[PDB]
Each structure stands twice: as structure tokens, then as C-alpha cells.
Ligand binder design. Structure first.
Ligand SMILES: CC(=O)N[C@@H]1[C@@H](O[C@@H]2O[C@H](CO)[C@H](O)[C@H](O)[C@H]2O)[C@@H](O)[C@@H](CO)O[C@@H]1O
Ligand SMILES: CC(=O)N[C@@H]1[C@@H](O[C@@H]2O[C@H](CO)[C@H](O)[C@H](O)[C@H]2O)[C@@H](O)[C@@H](CO)O[C@@H]1O
Ligand SMILES: CC(=O)N[C@@H]1[C@@H](O[C@@H]2O[C@H](CO)[C@H](O)[C@H](O)[C@H]2O)[C@@H](O)[C@@H](CO)O[C@@H]1O
Ligand SMILES: CC(=O)N[C@@H]1[C@@H](O[C@@H]2O[C@H](CO)[C@H](O)[C@H](O)[C@H]2O)[C@@H](O)[C@@H](CO)O[C@@H]1O
Lengths: 142, 142, 142, 142
């Protein structure tokens, strides 16, 4: 099994306050499950080669997704911003597979990624444990 | 908009204790979002014709999904039990659409449904507010 | 240290639906802390001789407390029903100590307790692991 | 009645990550209740003249309390840092009343408060809606 534990940091009240509105798990590698403990979020997966997505909404209406997973035994991440209401995590998560338009991002196996949304919100995923089967990352909103 | 608010009742400790491991929203009708308040769960959707799925896991390892949505202005529900780990909610939710194998169940527009899993766990969805745009249901595990 | 992990089972929608409104920890035995994981609640305490209280409110307005702790190396519990709004858990938890009016209930060291409230709600605390430092109990509202 | 709704912003992973370990409500003004919705926390109180406390623990072991309430129709707040394990919120909340050692801090009726702890964690409470019965504040750990 692989697990990825996420801690969510929100830095700037001027950007609003984000909460989870959806959590998906892709079906490769015997799937996996999201759980919550002590304010953290863990994605537990059956092996290397799958992922899951958290979609967040802010109290100012902004919609963004955070994807984390393991690709060929190395962690990966992505953040997609500027989402329309119909672009749910259920739409987004499969786009990383089957030659979909985000596959290249999974293939990068990034240990960190940073994006600013068109409305001006910074998002970062930064893995703090970057190797092994019990991975850890901070997800930072600003 | 349509909303469906769920209250989860668990009746029989001998069946174990269930917690949410995944939540999806289908992309029709401008999608929608899951939220939590006072121990309840609300699916808020952009109109009639979409749905979302909660997947639960028990502390005894059982995996089941609860689907709720609105079809032609009437509520519907379904429960799928006996799931394998790879049969995530991301796999299940689309099976209600595009002529998938569960579409017929959505089309029934049920206000209640009951199933017992092969391992012996009863599940019921019972709508307590069955009309209008602010729907309410109890989800009962036993 | 001692821990008590609680699983809350709500059985009967006719009683309404309860959520937590307060959680206290008494200061003996170097105090302790509440945490949440996978839908469960754990009170971790620095030794034998302290306790904590969860107060619940139903969506019908009912207020009740559940107390759990360890007294002379044995678990104890209590459920107080029919509470007025001014009788917060901060009022109730100290009543088990300093010769207060509920000390005798702590001294019973009960592994199970059953009480039905003035409005008809049945409450049960039943320890499923009843000995040792890693205690477990089901809290059932029926 | 008065309510105070809190949004918790954790800014700086270098301080570790905090989660709630206790929530108390003082018994004046007919008491009150904590609730959670969309990642936020609301204390609802029966009138002016009471308060509640959230205690937080970081994954580095740091213990701090945040107190919010209404005193003579104006909001107040406090943050106490450097707490020992025996100094639970049940100990701290009453210290603002009955001529206790923190009463003067309640009497200040602060709309903002900033303090840095012995281990270097910055804490700010800043009310964003500072008048009326539906108060709002950001709690920032930095
Ligand atoms: C070892 C690894 O990460 N492999 C990745 C693939 O994962 C495998 O996918 C298959 C289905 O094709 C099956 O579910 C296996 O259990 C799973 O490990 C897959 O994610 C591909 C996608 O391009 O990348 C790797 O090869
Ligand atoms: C009114 C209604 O419930 N219609 C259902 C359909 O929903 C519509 O679906 C389209 C896409 O085809 C679009 O997303 C609309 O916004 C949405 O209302 C759809 O769910 C079908 C599935 O067979 O059933 C109804 O017709
Ligand atoms: C061993 C045990 O459970 N003792 C109980 C007492 O707990 C002790 O209390 C003192 C303070 O007086 C101190 O906090 C110790 O750490 C703690 O173990 C206490 O709960 C009394 C209450 O009557 O019962 C036992 O003696
Ligand atoms: C109006 C107001 O905020 N009054 C504060 C007091 O609150 C009152 O307290 C009494 C009990 O003495 C009772 O519970 C009332 O309902 C409540 O409004 C109290 O907090 C004092 C503390 O010094 O300050 C104000 O007077």
C-alpha cells in the first residue's frame, strides 16, 4: 500500500476560506480510500499507479482541485484552478489517465507544484516526506 | 438548485461502524458540491438531472455506496453493496448515466430503498421530505 | 496513559438527530485531549483519575451529556439527560469530583449504563474493551 | 442571542499543525453551544455575558486556548499560550469570571488580539464583523 497524508494550511483571509466539497479515488491499483484524523486527510491506496482528488470551494465561490498519487513508485501532484461548477472532481480525476489531457502532469512525478488562479489565489502542494510508502504533503492556500 | 440533506443513523454495533471514504458529484446540471454541518451531509446541485455518491467503509472492511439525486424533478436513490476496493465511487456514480448498468435504478425515482449486503448488513435510504427543492433523507445502517 | 475511544450509534430517527456541542477534559491526572479519527472520538488522558464529557444536542432541542473516564484503574461512565441550556459540560464535568453530587456515579466504575430521558430518548454506553489502558465503548442513542 | 463564527487559518507549516482538543461553554447567559459547518466553528450563546474556549494542540505538542465571547454587548477575545497539559479549557474558561485572574482581559472587549508563544507560534484573533449579534472572526496561527 501507499498512503499520502495532507495538512491544509490557509494563509490569507483576503482570499476567502476553503472547504472540501468532493473527494474521489481512481480505480487503478485496487483503488483506495480517504480518511480524516486530527484535522488531516489521508489517501490510502492499494499500490502504486493510482491517485485521488480533493475539490475545494471557498466561501467566495472559487473552485479548485488538488490531485495526489503515486506513479511508478514516485509521488506526484497537481492543482487545477478556475473550475466551472460542472467540472467536478469526478470529471477531473480521470483526465490524468487513459491518455487524457492531464496525464503529462502525473508523469512528471512532482514533489512540489505552485499555481495562482486567475482570480489571484496562490496554491501550493509541497511534499515533506518525498520517498517511501507513507508520504506526507502540505497543501497551502494563499 | 436542488439540495439533498442526509442524516446517517447506525443501528447495530455488531455490523461495525461506517465512515465516509469518498464523495463524488456527477457533472450534469452544472454539477454540485457536498458540505457538512451539525453532523449532516448536504449535496447541493445546480438543477434537476444530476446526483452524487457517498462511499462508506466500515471498521470491519465492508465497502458500500449510497447514491442520491434528482431525475426529472423527482428524487432518487440507490445503495450498492459488496464492493471490491477498485469499485470506487468514481467508478459507480457514472454507471447511472450514459445508458450504464444502473440507469434503470435512477429512473425509478425512489423515495425509499432497502438492501442487505451479502455479509449481512442492512442499508436503507428513506426520504423524509420527498417533494420540492430542499429534500431530506435518512440513511440507516443495520 | 489511558485512552477511551467512542463510536456513536444513532438508531432511531424518531428521536431526532444529535451532534456534539461541547467537549471538556477534567484537570486531574495531567489532563487529556479529545481527538477525532474515522468518525470516532478518543479521549486520551495522562493517567488514571480523570475524565471528559461530550455534550450533544438533537435537532429537536434535547441536551444530554456523556461522561467517560478512569477511576482507580477501572473505566467509568455516566449519561445525564434532561439538561437545561445553562447546564453546560463545563458545569457537569466537575460535578464528579470534589465531593460533588455525581461523584458516587464515577465511583461505581460502570462498564455499561442505560438511561431513558424525559422526552423518551434511550441512551446506552457500553464498553466493548472493558479492561486495560486502551478502552473502547459504544454510545447508542435509541 | 449572540453568535461568533470562527475561521481558522494556519499559515506556517514550520509551527506544526494544530487541531482542536477541547471546546467549553461558560454557563452565564443561559449557556450556548458549539457547532461546525463548512470547516468553520460557531459558538451560539443565549445572550450577552458568556463565552466559550477552544483548546488546540499542535502535532509538535504545543497547547493553546482561544476564548471568544460577548461582554456588555461587545465582543471579546483572548489567546493563552504556553499551557501545561493539566491546564485544560475546563480550567481556563472559568478564569475569566468570578474575579478570576483573566477577568481583566474579558473586560477589555478586544476586537483583535496578537500574541506570540514561547515556542515562537504567532496567534491572532481578528474580528471581521465587530458589532451586532452575528459576529465573525478569523483565528490565525502563524
Ligand atoms: C507501478 C505503477 O505505478 N504503474 C502505473 C499504472 O498503474 C497500474 O495500472 C494498472 C491498470 O493499467 C493496474 O491498475 C495496476 O494495479 C496499477 O499499478 C498506471 O497508473 C499507468 C498509467 O499510465 O502508469 C503506471 O504504469
Ligand atoms: C430535467 C432532468 O432532470 N433531466 C435529466 C437530465 O439532466 C440534464 O442532463 C443534461 C445533459 O444531458 C444537462 O446536464 C442538464 O443540465 C441536466 O438537467 C439527465 O440526467 C438525463 C439522464 O438520462 O435524465 C433527465 O433527462
Ligand atoms: C489512581 C486514581 O484513579 N486516583 C483517583 C484520583 O486521581 C488522582 O487525582 C489527583 C488529584 O487529587 C491527581 O490528579 C492524580 O494524578 C490522579 O491520578 C481522583 O480522581 C480521585 C477522585 O476522588 O479518585 C481516585 O483516587
Ligand atoms: C450584559 C452582560 O454582558 N452582562 C455581563 C454578565 O452576564 C450576565 O451574567 C449573569 C450572571 O451573573 C447572567 O448569566 C446573565 O444572563 C448574563 O447576561 C457577566 O458576564 C459579568 C461578568 O463580570 O459581566 C457582565 O456584567
Amino acid at each position: 500500500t501507499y498512503s499520502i497524508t495532507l495538512r491544509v494550511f490557509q494563509r490569507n483571509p483576503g482570499r476567502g476560506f476553503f472547504s472540501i466539497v468532493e473527494k474521489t479515488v481512481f480505480h487503478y491499483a485496487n483503488g483506495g480510500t480517504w480518511s480524516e484524523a486530527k484535522g488531516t486527510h489521508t489517501l490510502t491506496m492499494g499500490g502504486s499507479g493510482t491517485s485521488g482528488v480533493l475539490r475545494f470551494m471557498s466561501d467566495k465561490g472559487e473552485l479548485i482541485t488538488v490531485a495526489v498519487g503515486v506513479h511508478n513508485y514516485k509521488r506526484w501532484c497537481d492543482v487545477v484552478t478556475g473550475l466551472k461548477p460542472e467540472e467536478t472532481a469526478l470529471v477531473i480525476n480521470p483526465q490524468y489517465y487513459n491518455n487524457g489531457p492531464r496525464a503529462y502532469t502525473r508523469e512528471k512525478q512532482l514533489a512540489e507544484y505552485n499555481v495562482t488562479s486567475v482570480v489571484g489565489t496562490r496554491f501550493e502542494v509541497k511534499y515533506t516526506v518525498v520517498e517511501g510508502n507513507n508520504l506526507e504533503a502540505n497543501v497551502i492556500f494563499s
